[PDB]
């Protein structure tokens, strides 16, 4: 579909057997999601933006479904104020910017 | 244009008569540029990102050309990690997400 940007581009995602809401975020290199206790191993990581850095857990090869489109990639989990779908997954669903 | 997301969606902008590079950021409500000199009045504002809040200078009704497309709107100037074009101006240039 086509999503205009008058409001935040929020969509429903499915991850770890749960449904969440997340922003389609072209300014996010990586995908960063609210605290959730996903199974399996992870690696510590720090990601930075406006205001500084936060500590997150990096999970690899995670299946996510975004508006019915399936993707598989790295997800960062931690105390983020907003769930964002980053370019690592947006490319996999064929998302482009158009003007 | 149609812009894929395998790389960062960086474009050239013109503001205050100066060329800069900025990131088309659908996750940003507002447009935030690194420290620079802009003519005219400004008001202090606070904005919040992934790591907390920062202080910025709010410039209203500023002319800015983004990848050949003109906008006139609010530009925030302060210690952002990178120049970002947010939805307040992405809407002005007719930018949508598509997949
Ligand atoms: C409950 C609400 O909490 P909140 O208000 C903050 O909420 C939000 C927090 C973050 C966002 C998304 C964030 N937008 C943002 O900063 O936008 C500012 C300006 O416009 C305003 O609108 C929204 C906030 C204000 C960017 O799209 C993406 N970011 C990187 C960019 C930084 C500008 C480029 C470097 S990233 O997230 O830092 C990030 C993501 C993946 C990644 N992989 C490796 S690094 C790395 C860094 C949206 C809402 O309170 C504060 C605690």
Swiss-Prot record, chains A, B:
Positions annotated as active site in the UniProt record: 25 (for protease activity)
Superkingdom of origin: Viruses
Annotated ranges, domain Peptidase A2: 20-89
Stretch list, region Dimerization of protease: 1-5, 49-55, 88-99
Subunit structure: Homodimer, whose active site consists of two apposed aspartic acid residues.
Protein name, per record: Protease
Boundaries of the shown chain within the full protein: 501 to 599 of 1447
């Amino acid at each position: 579909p086509q999503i205009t940007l008058w409001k935040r581009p929020l969509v429903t995602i499915k991850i770890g057997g749960q449904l969440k809401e997340a922003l389609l975020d072209t300014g996010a290199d990586d995908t960063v999601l609210e605290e959730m206790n996903l199974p399996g191993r992870w690696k510590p990581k720090m990601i930075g933006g406006i205001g500084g850095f936060i500590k997150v857990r990096q999970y690899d090869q995670i299946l996510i479904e975004i508006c019915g489109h399936k993707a598989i990639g790295t997800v960062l989990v931690g105390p983020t104020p907003v769930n964002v779908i980053g370019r690592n997954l947006l490319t996999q669903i064929g998302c482009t910017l158009n003007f």
